Amino acid sequence: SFANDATFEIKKCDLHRLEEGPPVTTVLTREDGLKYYRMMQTVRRMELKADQLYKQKIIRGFCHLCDGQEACCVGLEAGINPTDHLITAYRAHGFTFTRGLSVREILAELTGRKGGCAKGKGGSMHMYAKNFYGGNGIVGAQVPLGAGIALACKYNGKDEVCLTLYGDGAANQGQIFEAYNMAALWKLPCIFICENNRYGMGTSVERAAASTDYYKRGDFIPGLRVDGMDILCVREATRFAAAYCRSGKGPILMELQTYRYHGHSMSDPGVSYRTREEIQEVRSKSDPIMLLKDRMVNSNLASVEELKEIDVEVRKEIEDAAQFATADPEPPLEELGYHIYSSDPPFEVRGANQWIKFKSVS
Amino acid sequence: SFANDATFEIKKCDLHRLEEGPPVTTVLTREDGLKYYRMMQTVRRMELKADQLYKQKIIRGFCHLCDGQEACCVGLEAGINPTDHLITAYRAHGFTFTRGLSVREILAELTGRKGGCAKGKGGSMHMYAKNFYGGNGIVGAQVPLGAGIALACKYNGKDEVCLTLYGDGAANQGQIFEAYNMAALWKLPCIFICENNRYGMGTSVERAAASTDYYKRGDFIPGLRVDGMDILCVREATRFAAAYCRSGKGPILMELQTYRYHGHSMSDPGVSYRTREEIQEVRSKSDPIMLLKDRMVNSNLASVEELKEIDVEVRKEIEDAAQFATADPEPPLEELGYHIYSSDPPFEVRGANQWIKFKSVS
Amino acid sequence: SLQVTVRDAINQGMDEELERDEKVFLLGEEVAQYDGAYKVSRGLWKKYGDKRIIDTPISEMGFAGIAVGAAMAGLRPICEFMTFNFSMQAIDQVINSAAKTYYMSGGLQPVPIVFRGPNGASAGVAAQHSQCFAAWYGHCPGLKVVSPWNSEDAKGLIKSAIRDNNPVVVLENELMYGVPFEFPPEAQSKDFLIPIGKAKIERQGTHITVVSHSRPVGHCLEAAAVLSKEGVECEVINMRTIRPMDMETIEASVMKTNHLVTVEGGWPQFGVGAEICARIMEGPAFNFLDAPAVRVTGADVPMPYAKILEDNSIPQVKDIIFAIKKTLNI
Amino acid sequence: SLQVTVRDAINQGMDEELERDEKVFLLGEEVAQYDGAYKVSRGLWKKYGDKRIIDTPISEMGFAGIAVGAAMAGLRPICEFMTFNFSMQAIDQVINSAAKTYYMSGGLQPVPIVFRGPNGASAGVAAQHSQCFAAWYGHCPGLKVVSPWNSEDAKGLIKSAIRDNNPVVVLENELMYGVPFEFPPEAQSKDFLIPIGKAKIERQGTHITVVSHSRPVGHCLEAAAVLSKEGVECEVINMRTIRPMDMETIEASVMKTNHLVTVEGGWPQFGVGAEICARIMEGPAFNFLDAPAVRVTGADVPMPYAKILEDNSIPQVKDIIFAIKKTLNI
Numbered sequence A, B: 001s002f003a004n005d006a007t008f009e010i011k012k013c014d015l016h017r018l019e020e021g022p023p024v025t026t027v028l029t030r031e032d033g034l035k036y037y038r039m040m041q042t043v044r045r046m047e048l049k050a051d052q053l054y055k056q057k058i059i060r061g062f063c064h065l066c067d068g069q070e071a072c073c074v075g076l077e078a079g080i081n082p083t084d085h086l087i088t089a090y091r092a093h094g095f096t097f098t099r100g101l102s103v104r105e106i107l108a109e110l111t112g113r114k115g116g117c118a119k120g121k122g123g124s125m126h127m128y129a130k131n132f133y134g135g136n137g138i139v140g141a142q143v144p145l146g147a148g149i150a151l152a153c154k155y156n157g158k159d160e161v162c163l164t165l166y167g168d169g170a171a172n173q174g175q176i177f178e179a180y181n182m183a184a185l186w187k188l189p190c191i192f193i194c195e196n197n198r199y200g201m202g203t204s205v206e207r208a209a210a211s212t213d214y215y216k217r218g219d220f221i222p223g224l225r226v227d228g229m230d231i232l233c234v235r236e237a238t239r240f241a242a243a244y245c246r247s248g249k250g251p252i253l254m255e256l257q258t259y260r261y262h263g264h265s266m267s268d269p270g271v272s273y274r275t276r277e278e279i280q281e282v283r284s285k286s287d288p289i290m291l292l293k294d295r296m297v298n299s300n301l302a303s304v305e306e307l308k309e310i311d312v313e314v315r316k317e318i319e320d321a322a323q324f325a326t327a328d329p330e331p332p333l334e335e336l337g338y339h340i341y342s343s344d345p346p347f348e349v350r351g352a353n354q355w356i357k358f359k360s361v362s
Numbered sequence C, D: 001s002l003q004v005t006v007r008d009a010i011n012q013g014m015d016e017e018l019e020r021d022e023k024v025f026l027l028g029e030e031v032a033q034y035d036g037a038y039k040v041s042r043g044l045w046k047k048y049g050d051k052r053i054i055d056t057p058i059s060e061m062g063f064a065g066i067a068v069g070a071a072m073a074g075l076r077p078i079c080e081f082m083t084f085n086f087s088m089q090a091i092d093q094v095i096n097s098a099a100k101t102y103y104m105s106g107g108l109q110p111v112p113i114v115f116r117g118p119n120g121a122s123a124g125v126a127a128q129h130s131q132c133f134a135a136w137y138g139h140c141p142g143l144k145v146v147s148p149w150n151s152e153d154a155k156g157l158i159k160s161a162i163r164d165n166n167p168v169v170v171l172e173n174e175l176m177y178g179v180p181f182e183f184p185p186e187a188q189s190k191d192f193l194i195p196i197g198k199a200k201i202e203r204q205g206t207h208i209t210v211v212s213h214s215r216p217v218g219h220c221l222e223a224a225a226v227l228s229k230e231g232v233e234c235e236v237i238n239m240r241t242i243r244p245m246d247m248e249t250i251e252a253s254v255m256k257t258n259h260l261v262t263v264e265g266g267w268p269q270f271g272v273g274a275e276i277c278a279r280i281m282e283g284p285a286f287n288f289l290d291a292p293a294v295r296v297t298g299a300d301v302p303m304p305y306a307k308i309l310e311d312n313s314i315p316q317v318k319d320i321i322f323a324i325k326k327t328l329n330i
């Protein structure tokens, strides 16, 4: 009945200081397709749910959604090992899930309850997981950190690599350039990834960068530009970049051309610097979930009915997770001073006045 | 009866993203040759004297000598107008002189006397003058400042340009890259100059930079590599860079290949990372002053006797300055708090304890 | 005479100074076409264009240094940090390039620049976006630091900041931006100026002196209203300037009330409250004290996300009242 | 017996920790082949190699961030800043990426890293190279800040810092590097550790408590010797730790002497002395104070270059003795 695997054509990557790039043809098994589809769908529904909870004021402060960029987190995960490392900025709900955290833990952290992955201490921007280092709020700060994690990989000789992600807006931060230099100087297994969604908050790439060829900003470091809406292209480029780094050749730059459907954050309607027609055009022409779906249905890797059933299962998983995140209690006030220092005996911490004391345990 | 002027051939500059570079031939008049000679000679003797005063404990703290880089400061000045702007790092005794400050003022500031260009408040690393903004101790900090001065030049529309110098060591500072992006984005009349003297303190360029082609690090910004030992090469490239910026074409990167005979600073012998023979070889074959000398005599622009006469006057001048600086009284303690704020009415400033009060006047 | 928010008072101040001097210009992230990250610079770009209102890439250290360089060359820049948490990347330019320059040059190089933007705690922004920098900046010589509370403070201080010929740090508050205040005709004038270095008594009192700056000033006033019904009269002082602070007004008040309480939103150790208490103990007001001065501040932990945790990490009216009753022993 | 300089003590500590744990490594400008900008890491590269002792290009923000990353990944980096004046370019990595991570992550991500280097005034280095950052770092929760004076301090504190599992800032002093002190057999041991958070009484006294940290501690002992010949006995306390400071020890001393004087080399406003005076005022020892506490600090101006001016910008023994006589009215 169903094909067990199918070959597809993927866009050729633009190269910088590379003789040859990833292959322009790849094989997708039915088993992998089903996994990728379910994963992207979960990320998609989780973000639409976060949006709803935010409007209801269940979620506070910052809340950056990644819908439209699902091919990036799922495609990246598909190209690396669970033992590999990854770090990114604040738009990391998708990455937290692909790296192993349940939808429940994630939504519970967004709603600031005790059951959150951080127990309501960090919120939307600061989530950690196995070999996932955030989830960082200061633009560009995560790049030198990723180089540091890559240094540790080399130092311990484990043959693992580190994926360091940053946006187009962050590509103009000076520390990113100090990082390129050191990574190349010490040949660190660092994969520098620029997620280019065309806008730095409200500023388009052309108004913020003198040069919009992000994959070549590394100069002496080789790079490649990839189609960030095609899960298969991302997976292929990632497998290529990872193998490049594991062979000891040093760092490499990867530019993912993608797009975000929502504004910069929940407080930005995202229409003062771009039109509604543009957003819908990208959606109808290249929604990553739609593209994978059409591929699998056409190649008979899966039926339109099976994919529909998966959607139903995902929607229920999301709903049950949201129920848990809105019913779960807040962290008790008595643990406010907890985890200031690691491996230290208990001590007291001052509150709003000298008569208010909070216990602090590691 | 000497030639009024002569034509000389200069080495072609390496170019990065430039259709054409500076001319390969230039005309040197007798009046200019004699002038540049005296200038480079003055700077050379002034630094050797500073060195001597340091060993005698007359000068404290930092004291970086530009000994051997005379063709750069004199050559740069020869290529710009007095209304143009310049800013560099801490090794700028020569630049302060070429920008208009007397040797007396410079040495008096080094010996911390009231006769110093800063009343003894700044020292070796902080000296200002007309359109000369220091004299900056934080490596790399002067590049964004230079871009700001360039911004002001564009804003005022007087056709002035700004020369911003930084060492090869400073070339790996992140802020320099942030400055490149903005200068290109806004087409600022900024000439970024990298004085490549092969060493960032004790670290050779090959150990600190993945790429040692500094005139190209700007990536999207055009650049050129210049022989920083030939004053006529520097003057010609400088005149070219300035015209490029005045024409409204934006920033340009200029790399001057030079060398420093002394160590990084007075506290560094500068022989643990390089051999004495290397220093001697460069001095023997490419000393900036000897190169100009042999050029003027051979072309009958001047006589060896006349140059020897200039050397005697220069030595005399430096000796008088050194006498002044060593005999000039220290600044009065009553002015310790002066000039903290500009255009403000006087006020009290606290000393070592609450009972010690210093007056502060703008 | 009319209602105007802090956001609109600051916008008014900048607008008037931009019209008054062509050397003044604004630069920062999203300050132009986006109308400002918090809409404070709204309408400015549309009125003055690309030359005066400049959007910049996300390069803090970079554009801060550029602003300082433009100031050394004679221009009078207003450099906006989206939040001061981000000013840490550019703090070297503020301290080592802007603040010490006039002194280092022996009075030859002045630096007329203004650094402004929201400072301190907001709402649910977590640890990396809730830090108060009043104490850090107020610690450096050659710098002037102001922290306005209401609309009148905001407009008067920003204009004075722009006119001063030295670097001035204006620590605003995001939570105060949308709060409306009664704007008298004197504040509506384009000549309205509030001098840097002078405190203000927002409420006269005889029982105790309560000193604060920025948003918490509002909490002190509410605290004063509640205690008032109990027969306790608080003298609420709005610092306005962090450096150079007006200790004379504070001491004069203490000589009358014999009791002192400071309220701030930042971390307690080495904070603003500590400096006030030390100044009090070193000055002539120490002997007028009938009880030790007490400090109300934010909790000594990085800002937690959870609502109930965040509320207990920032001083509340009840914390202020509790500290006052302790000092008065009632 | 054995007499060792502070520089040698620090070198011994690092060397012993490097041998003890292969995950410990040193990085910074000129730390390897150059043997150290101030020779503190002399011989380390020769013995351990390019992997354990890494020379870095001049990229503060960069390698500090690289260091934090390596620590998060399980390594124990010792990040050296040539001087702390240069740490401003990377202070964001120290505060937002290192100090707050354990808390924000809910206790999942520790950051065992050490930041060390000379702090404060030197000899003729001018304004941009003489700033003291004790007050700045000690203000931040999640960080530990220590400031050693003599050889014992240096060795014990660097070893404790390296073994701690949280970010530790070690503020050293360049003028102290070459100063020799007697090194007891105990300090000679590879097991010598000084607990972070405990002050040490360098001199027993009954008439007044003098608290200080770093280089000025030597000045206080100098002042104490001069005063004893006059009949005044000072109790000198070496803080050792800025955060969390040992206030308990200071209070026990004040409750005996009834007088307090703080001495520091940094700027007065919002400085270390201010926090101590605020703590004493809010603490149990306040009722034991017979005279207000006074602060001795560096002048409130950026560091001048001229010798005579610099001599009066830093606290001298005469200023300490003066302050002490004023407090004791003698």
Ligand SMILES: Cc1ncc(C[n+]2csc(CCOP(=O)(O)OP(=O)(O)O)c2C)c(N)n1
Pocket: A091, A137, A138, A139, A166, A167, A168, A169, A170, A171, A195, A197, A199, A200, A201, A264, C029, C058, C060, C082, C086, C089
């Ligand atoms: C150092 C710093 N400066 C400014 C900000 C404010 N800020 C938060 S997100 C953002 C936009 C970053 O855009 P981009 O890197 O392109 O990523 P995207 O949100 O599009 O994924 C800005 C300027 C910050 N977080 N950190």
Ligand SMILES: Cc1ncc(C[n+]2csc(CCOP(=O)(O)OP(=O)(O)O)c2C)c(N)n1
Pocket: B064, B091, B137, B138, B139, B140, B166, B167, B168, B169, B170, B171, B195, B197, B199, B200, B201, B264, D029, D058, D060, D082, D086, D089
């Ligand atoms: C931000 C900063 N980091 C480190 C230093 C210490 N430092 C002073 S000079 C120097 C060497 C700079 O070398 P280079 O830029 O090549 O200039 P040169 O002295 O050779 O002209 C270093 C590392 C500093 N002053 N500022």
Ligand SMILES: [K+]
Pocket: C111, C112, C113, C114, C161, C162, C163, C164, C165, C166, C167, C168
């Ligand atoms: K100003």
Ligand SMILES: [K+]
Pocket: D111, D112, D113, D114, D161, D162, D163, D164, D165, D166, D167, D168
């Ligand atoms: K540590």
Ligand SMILES: [Mg+2]
Pocket: A167, A168, A169, A195, A196, A197, A198, A199, A200, A201
């Ligand atoms: Mg973007």
Ligand SMILES: [Mg+2]
Pocket: B167, B168, B169, B195, B196, B197, B198, B199, B200, B201
């Ligand atoms: Mg050099």
